[PDB]
Amino acid sequence: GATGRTTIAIDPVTRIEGHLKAEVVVENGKVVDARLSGGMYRGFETILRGRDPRDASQIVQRICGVCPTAHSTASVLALDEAFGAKVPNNGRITRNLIFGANYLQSHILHFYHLSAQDFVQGPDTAPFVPRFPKSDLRLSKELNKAGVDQYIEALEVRRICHEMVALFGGRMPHVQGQVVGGATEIPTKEKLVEYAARFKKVRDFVEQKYVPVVYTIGSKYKDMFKVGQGFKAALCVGAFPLDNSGKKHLFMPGVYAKGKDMPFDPSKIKEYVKYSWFAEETTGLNYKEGKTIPAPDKAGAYSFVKAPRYDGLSLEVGPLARMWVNNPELSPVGKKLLKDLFGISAKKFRDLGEEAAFSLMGRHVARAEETYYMLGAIEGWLKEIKAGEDTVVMPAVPASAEGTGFTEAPRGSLLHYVKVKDSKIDNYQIVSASLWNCNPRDDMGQRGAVEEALIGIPVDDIQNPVNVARLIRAFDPXLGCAVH
Amino acid sequence: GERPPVFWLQGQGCTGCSVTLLNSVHPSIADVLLKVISLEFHPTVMAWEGEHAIEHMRKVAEKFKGKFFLVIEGSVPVEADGKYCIIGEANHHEISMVDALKEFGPNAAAVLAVGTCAAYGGIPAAEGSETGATAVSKFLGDNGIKTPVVNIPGCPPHPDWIVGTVVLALDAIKKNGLEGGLAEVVKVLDSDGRPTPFFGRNIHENCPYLDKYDEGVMSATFTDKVGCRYDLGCKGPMTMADCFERKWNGGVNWCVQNAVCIGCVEPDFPDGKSPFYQA
Numbered sequence: 001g002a003t004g005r006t007t008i009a010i011d012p013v014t015r016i017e018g019h020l021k022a023e024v025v026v027e028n029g030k031v032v033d034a035r036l037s038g039g040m041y042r043g044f045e046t047i048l049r050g051r052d053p054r055d056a057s058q059i060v061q062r063i064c065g066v067c068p069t070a071h072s073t074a075s076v077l078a079l080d081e082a083f084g085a086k087v088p089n090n091g092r093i094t095r096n097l098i099f100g101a102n103y104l105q106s107h108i109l110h111f112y113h114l115s116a117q118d119f120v121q122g123p124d125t126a127p128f129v130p131r132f133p134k135s136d137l138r139l140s141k142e143l144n145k146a147g148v149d150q151y152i153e154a155l156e157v158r159r160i161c162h163e164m165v166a167l168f169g170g171r172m173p174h175v176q177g178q179v180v181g182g183a184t185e186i187p188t189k190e191k192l193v194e195y196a197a198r199f200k201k202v203r204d205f206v207e208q209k210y211v212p213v214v215y216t217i218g219s220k221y222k223d224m225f226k227v228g229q230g231f232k233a234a235l236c237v238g239a240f241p242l243d244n245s246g247k248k249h250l251f252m253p254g255v256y257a258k259g260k261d262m263p264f265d266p267s268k269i270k271e272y273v274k275y276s277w278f279a280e281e282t283t284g285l286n287y288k289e290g291k292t293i294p295a296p297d298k299a300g301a302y303s304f305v306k307a308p309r310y311d312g313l314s315l316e317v318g319p320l321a322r323m324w325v326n327n328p329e330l331s332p333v334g335k336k337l338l339k340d341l342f343g344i345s346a347k348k349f350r351d352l353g354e355e356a357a358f359s360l361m362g363r364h365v366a367r368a369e370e371t372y373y374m375l376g377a378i379e380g381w382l383k384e385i386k387a388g389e390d391t392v393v394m395p396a397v398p399a400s401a402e403g404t405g406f407t408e409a410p411r412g413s414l415l416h417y418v419k420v421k422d423s424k425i426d427n428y429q430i431v432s433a434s435l436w437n438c439n440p441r442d443d444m445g446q447r448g449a450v451e452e453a454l455i456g457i458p459v460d461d462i463q464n465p466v467n468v469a470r471l472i473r474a475f476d477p478x479l480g481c482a483v484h
Numbered sequence: 485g486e487r488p489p490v491f492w493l494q495g496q497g498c499t500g501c502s503v504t505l506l507n508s509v510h511p512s513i514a515d516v517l518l519k520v521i522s523l524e525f526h527p528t529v530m531a532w533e534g535e536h537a538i539e540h541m542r543k544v545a546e547k548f549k550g551k552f553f554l555v556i557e558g559s560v561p562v563e564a565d566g567k568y569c570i571i572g573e574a575n576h577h578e579i580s581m582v583d584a585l586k587e588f589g590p591n592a593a594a595v596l597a598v599g600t601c602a603a604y605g606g607i608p609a610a611e612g613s614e615t616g617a618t619a620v621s622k623f624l625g626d627n628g629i630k631t632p633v634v635n636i637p638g639c640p641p642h643p644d645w646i647v648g649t650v651v652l653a654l655d656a657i658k659k660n661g662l663e664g665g666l667a668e669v670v671k672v673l674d675s676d677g678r679p680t681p682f683f684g685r686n687i688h689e690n691c692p693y694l695d696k697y698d699e700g701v702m703s704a705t706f707t708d709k710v711g712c713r714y715d716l717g718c719k720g721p722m723t724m725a726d727c728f729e730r731k732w733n734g735g736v737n738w739c740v741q742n743a744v745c746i747g748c749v750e751p752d753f754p755d756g757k758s759p760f761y762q763a
């Protein structure tokens with residue numbers, strides 16, 4: 001160690017999904033180094049081997065019960081390619097309705113049930129107490145009460161989102177309704193009425209309560225737009241196909257780094273393991289050649305998360321990444337509240353500016369704006385879907401094949417790669433969103449995205465170091481996804 | 485009534501068993517948390533963090549020794565000296581799931597093994613795994629810990645199975661005291677440790693498509709909802725759950741209507757229920 005440098009370890013980091021330890025070094029009241037450790041491993045990539053490939057679209061969902069529809073989607077897209085299946089148009093749209101509804105669930109869950117206690121004092125009973133004696137909770141009595149009331153209402157709203165998922169997905173968590181070849185249940189006129197009625201309630205909550213409260217709370221934490229920048233580099237791999245030719249997507253792919261936009265080339269992804277608990281000979285592999293050989297005793301390693309890099313770059317993923325890459329128009333309420341509460345004149349997302357967008361609070365804003373954006377996408381799919389039109393084909397299992405499915409989980413880019421040999425899974429490799437965010441150093445010593453975003457985070461009180469986990473929560477981590 | 489303290493520990497879970505609980509309708513999860521239990525430790529939702537959260541759990545555990553309920557989500561991996569699941573750190577020493585279950589398991593009133601992973605090993609214990617993923621009851625027994633275990637399986641369970649089992653146990657305790665009530669809970673469990681209110685009926689015997697099964701009228705595509713789903717892989721015939729009646733997510737669907745049952749509540753899930761898409 002060194003005089004003036006104080007180490008803080010937080011394990012478990014709570015109000016995230018899954019098992020994470022954060023270790024930071026604080027000097028002069030700011031984080032100067034960071035290490036993130038994903039401490040739980042299951043090994044889905046080896047569990048999957050030898051199975052009927054169709055089983056994958058059920059097995060993979062159990063990577064993560066918060067974002068199972070993302071894994072389902074990536075898996076069925078990979079299987080569609082491997083099997084040569086042409087998903088019927090109406091099944092493409094049904095898939096988008098199943099998965100889009102979980103974007104609404106997941107963002108609402110994240111802001112209210114995971115993040116809002118960073119800023120809101122809950123009722124005086126467990127699990128809302130005890131907490132840090134100096135929790136830095138700045139809201140007025142009235143705005144804090146609105147936060148609590150909305151937390152409670154959001155418990156109902158996120159449940160309704162899962163009813164929306166289940167209408168054509170069968171149940172949730174863990175849908176039955178997406179398979180290779182499309183979706184297993186044709187939407188009926190009656191069940192589309194049920195989906196739209198629930199959607200209207202979610203839409204109203206998002207527009208009237210959620211998006212406004214994020215900007216309003218953010219306006220009491222303006223300092224949190226000035227920290228958490230990290231590398232200011234982002235990835236999007238595309239998601240929600242809008243046609244049957246694989247071209248247009250709701251979120252279009254791209255990479256942003258060092259102030260430059262560039263296309264996404266998946267051959268530039270490699271996964272490093274020097275600082276991860278996997279065998280040394282497996283380092284530096286693109287996912288098509290990926291290998292998962294655990295090495296829990298390997299010297300120097302500190303995580304079960306591999307370290308993915310994009311042409312050597314350490315990138316982040318998630319709502320901020322997608323909204324930055326795609327640069328949509330901001331919501332009406334966001335444009336007004338940016339002006340009224342912050343003095344910011346903005347029309348498109350990038351009008352926030354790089355510094356404020358790539359910040360702790362900027363990532364919460366991006367997630368709220370994306371939730372509003374998804375409302376319009378779901379409205380479009382409700383207009384486009386046709387009651388009664390077939391949604392599935394029934395392809396046979398190929399003897400030998402490969403496929404890759406790319407999508408955007410609520411927390412960021414997700415791909416699944418499958419290689420089939422003798423009609424069974426020969427290899428299955430997963431590169432997930434919180435893997436891109438919450439990974440350790442690579443073989444070159446370059447930190448992961450959240451590790452780097454922690455640098456500079458203020459810790460004026462080592463005994464109440466609340467901003468360390470606040471920064472982490474802005475990325476909405478799920479370590480089940482990250483490690484699998 | 486006094487809300488008993490509950491600690492919810494996650495091992496090799498996916499958090500699906502917490503999310504399914506958040507979907508409870510009657511009672512709502514708000515009512516469960518504010519009126520039914522005192523959820524003192526839960527890493528996904530609690531206010532505090534890190535060593536402070538662990539210390540809080542330990543202080544409650546000391547005060548309510550013998551009286552708290554321990555929910556386990558996920559399997560317990562024993563390989564590599566427990567290193568495949570580290571759940572926290574305190575006093576500058578990591579805490580594995582193995583360690584945590586050995587610490588708190590002996591002192592709980594009862595352990596609720598929620599989800600098929602905790603109940604039976606589940607996907608983390610399936611073929612191709614290498615972590616020594618172990619079911620809660622087997623781990624406790626292997627380590628000499630005699631605390632009663634109730635299995636509430638499913639991948640995930642329905643919220644009503646989790647909440648309903650908690651309520652059944654708390655009501656039994658109100659009526660007969662802690663020891664007598666837990667004895668009554670054990671009496672309503674099947675041979676796989678599951679409460680018979682939710683797991684005592686077979687899906688297939690109660691399925692709305694049973695007539696089609698008997699007539700040999702089978703669907704050849706998933707979207708044909710007329711025929712029986714057996715040839716498409718339905719495992720209803722070997723599955724004990726009440727999904728045919730309570731259905732899922734506010735009654736809007738269930739697995740057999742939408743696609744197939746994959747047998748997710750059963751001790752051999754997934755391997756004994758696979759391949760999922762043929763008989």
Ligand code: SF4
Nearest residue numbers: 688691712713718720
């Ligand atoms: S095989 Fe499945 S769909 Fe057919 S009657 Fe049995 S439970 Fe119902």
Ligand code: SF4
Nearest residue numbers: 727739745746747748
């Ligand atoms: S119908 Fe079968 S797969 Fe679906 S929840 Fe019930 S037991 Fe599990």
Ligand code: FCO
Nearest residue numbers: 067409410411434481
């Ligand atoms: N959202 C989500 Fe899950 C994560 N991280 C994936 O991919």
Ligand SMILES: [Cl-]
Nearest residue numbers: 067069070102
């Ligand atoms: Cl998802």
Ligand SMILES: [Fe+2]
Nearest residue numbers: 429430431484
């Ligand atoms: Fe992976």
Ligand code: NI
Nearest residue numbers: 064067478481
């Ligand atoms: Ni996830």
Ligand SMILES: [S]
Nearest residue numbers: 064066067478
């Ligand atoms: S997630």
